[PDB]
Amino acid sequence: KVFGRCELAAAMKRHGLDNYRGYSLGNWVCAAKFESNFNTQATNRNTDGSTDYGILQINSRWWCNDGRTPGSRNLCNIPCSALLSSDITASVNCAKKIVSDGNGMNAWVAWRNRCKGTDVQAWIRGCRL
Numbered sequence: 001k002v003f004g005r006c007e008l009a010a011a012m013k014r015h016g017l018d019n020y021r022g023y024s025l026g027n028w029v030c031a032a033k034f035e036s037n038f039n040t041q042a043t044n045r046n047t048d049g050s051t052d053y054g055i056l057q058i059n060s061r062w063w064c065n066d067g068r069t070p071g072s073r074n075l076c077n078i079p080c081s082a083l084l085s086s087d088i089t090a091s092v093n094c095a096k097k098i099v100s101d102g103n104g105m106n107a108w109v110a111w112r113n114r115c116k117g118t119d120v121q122a123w124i125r126g127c128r129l
């Protein structure tokens with residue numbers, strides 16, 4: 001599914017990512033925007049042979065199992081294909097462990113390079129309240 005901006009902010013809020021580990025909702029929406037363009041089905045291979053999956057481009061190296069990534073830790077105890085669902089529950093549950101692993105949202109290099117430092121609340125503008 002390709003999420004609308006406000007629609008994904010809604011889902012993310014309801015699934016508890018707003019202020020999760022100190023990161024406001026605009027931060028999570030901005031990172032989904034530049035990781036996946038709000039598309040749950042987005043998959044992108046990395047140069048180390050692991051692949052990134054879904055709305056927040058969660059890596060098969062540490063977090064989810066895809067079978068084709070030697071060394072895979074699968075710390076979210078999940079198949080990577082489950083991160084591609086219409087319902088973002090699993091991607092958010094896994095994201096909560098990644099933001100907590102020590103480097104915050106710097107784990108998302110798209111968030112670190114684009115979003116971090118910027119006006120991220122622009123990403124929840126006009127959205128219902």
